[PDB]
Design a protein around this ligand. Structure first.
Ligand SMILES: Nc1ncnc2c1ncn2[C@@H]1O[C@H](CO)[C@@H](O)[C@H]1O
Ligand SMILES: Nc1ncnc2c1ncn2[C@@H]1O[C@H](CO)[C@@H](O)[C@H]1O
Ligand SMILES: CC(=O)NC1=CCC2=C(CC=C2)C1
Ligand SMILES: CC(=O)NC1=CCC2=C(CC=C2)C1
Ligand SMILES: [K+]
Ligand SMILES: [K+]
Lengths: 330, 330
């Protein structure tokens, strides 16, 4: 018996969420459906144009850890906030979910990361992220005991943007593999992949990463192709297990030559896609660490993803375990 | 032409919102459906026990101002936040809605007020409020020109708790009436009424308040009666106009011997009653300052109240003006 099923590592972010029209994104040069990095001045400027907003704890990996805890698994998180009110909110929400979160803040400055997320009428989300205190995450924040005692350690491709987080991840991969655990990553965002394509491929080809999460856009970007079938063949050659999401078309789980197709759940309405991929990973990694089949991991993923997109905010406000019990997936 | 239709004055608060079970309120001796004042120590203690939460700008009068602006009226607000992240959030949200908000923070401590609002399965809300920087609101925060230039100045009964706010209110009343404007209050909460019963009756009887908002519980508390008909007759005798809400039973508007009953909108499901009274006041006061009939003001109030109770959070995320146009209220 081990202390943790899933440790996740990411940019610790609080989300500031508002609805906008399509022209708002165009007028403000915001790349739709993407993570747009911004500096402190741009953050002030954007906020000055944003409508009344709602705040909720975010961070892709943060969301994923919370989702595993919600489903009933044992989760931990590494990610750096500041000693400020936003950081206290982030700390509260993740711990209150029953995630082990012990990363110490280094001061009040830079302040806690925030992301202004604009949701359009079609339910797509466009994120505008000031990394703030995330830039300080480094090898010093690796709790080696936690990595040693987690079945899976999972991290964001997004971590390649801040300067020293990658060093922490290399320490994680070493500790994880020394203790016979598995490493996982998400490709995070298609432009993120464009920035770090070579480095991501190397993580997979060198065996530092065992399980890879991607959506259609990220897989196409990884191989710079318009051919989805080619991307699927190539990603299967590059990592031991690949979980590839395709929005309303569900997901495909690949292992060697094995392919497992899973359907999207029936949805009332796409309210807000924020966290869909994060919660897919929650469902998948929960199933995975519970010894479930890869198909059943896929189903658990589509379930969590389906639930999160029908609400505003990135972390399901309802019991995932209850839904899984109701859905016949338990 | 006047610069403002409605100026509101209240405790400037950010809400921290979570769902709980019935036993949680009992275990923590939280009075259900009430505003429970708390100190800094109790705030920390309650937060430690609270689940994952969502934050949104609140304050009863702040909400009412936001609602007036959403409907298309011209609104202003007085209320005091600290120079901190929560204060920056509050400032952003109210200004982003098109409310004039120019109250200057006086420092970083006490920090910006927050209320931990626990929403039970029945959709009822139980608020736990640390006043923080609200305690510093005083005569120095009265923008004389704003009061002089507002058709109605509306204020919270809740303002009787912090020490100096009442002085600002008496200043508003003098300026408003010197400029031929009208003053309005809400009774806010039945325990608030219990704390300040003599004072509230004096405000009405002396004519410092022209228009009073009450719900059934507040009206019963004001006269310490179980007889609602008695409460209605007495409130009508004590103020020029009284607007009395009865939850699902709608509302009754009283002027001298005139009574105008309005039906509550019929509801799919009550999600979170937070903001119902506040937004009833938004609709009513928007109607009132547009020269509408007392019944139509009640109609507009019930429309806004019905919309806010079908969403999480205290300020409607949808267009009240659009809803009003669809409703033939325009
Ligand atoms: N650069 C980033 N790194 C990690 N997570 C991010 C970044 N930008 C936005 N997010 C988070 O992505 C989540 C949705 O996947 C949001 O909750 C948001 O907080
Ligand atoms: N003491 C208080 N004074 C004014 N408003 C309050 C108080 N406590 C809670 N509220 C606000 O009441 C609103 C709901 O009517 C919530 O948005 C909350 O912020
Ligand atoms: C796999 C995934 O991300 N989940 C989903 C994303 C979008 C979407 C669904 C169902 C309909 C639209 C499910
Ligand atoms: C008059 C008013 O406040 N409107 C309503 C308040 C509460 C409530 C309704 C319908 C069900 C609960 C309508
Ligand atoms: K969402
Ligand atoms: K509400």
């Amino acid at each position: 018996m081990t202390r943790f099923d899933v440790l996740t590592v990411g940019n610790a972010i609080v989300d500031i969420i508002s609805r906008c029209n399509d022209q708002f994104l165009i007028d403000n040069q915001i790349t739709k459906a993407a993570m747009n990095l911004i500096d402190a001045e741009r953050a002030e400027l954007l906020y000055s144009r944003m409508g009344p907003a709602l705040e909720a704890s975010g961070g892709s990996a943060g969301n994923t850890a919370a989702g595993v805890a919600n489903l009933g698994g044992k989760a931990a998180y590494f990610g750096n906030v500041a000693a400020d009110q936003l950081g206290d909110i982030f700390t509260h929400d993740i711990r209150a979910q029953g995630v082990h979160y012990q990363t110490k803040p280094k001061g009040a400055f830079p302040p806690t990361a925030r992301s202004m997320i604009f949701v359009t009428e079609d339910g797509e989300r466009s994120m505008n992220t000031y990394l703030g205190a995330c830039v300080e995450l480094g090898p010093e924040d690796v709790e080696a005991d936690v990595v040693a005692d987690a079945k899976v350690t999972y991290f964001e491709g997004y971590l390649w943007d801040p300067p020293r987080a990658k060093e922490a991840i290399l320490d994680c991969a070493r500790i994880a593999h020394q203790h016979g655990r598995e490493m996982s990553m998400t490709l995070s965002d298609s432009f993120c992949v464009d920035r770090y394509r070579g480095e991501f491929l190397d993580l997979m080809r060198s065996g530092k990463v065992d399980i890879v999460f991607a959506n259609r856009q990220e897989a196409l970007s990884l191989y710079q192709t318009d051919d989805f079938e080619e991307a699927l063949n190539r990603i299967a050659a590059d990592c031991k297990i690949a979980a590839v999401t395709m929005s309303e078309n569900g997901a495909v789980i690949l292992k060697g030559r094995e392919r497992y197709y899973v359907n999207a759940i029936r949805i009332r309405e796409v309210v807000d896609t924020t966290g869909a991929g994060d919660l897919f990973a929650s469902g998948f990694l929960y199933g995975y660490t519970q010894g479930r089949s890869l198909e059943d991991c896929g189903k658990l993923g589509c379930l969590a993803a389906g639930i999160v997109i029908q609400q505003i905010g990135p972390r399901p406000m309802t019991s995932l375990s209850e839904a899984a019990k109701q859905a016949g997936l338990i």
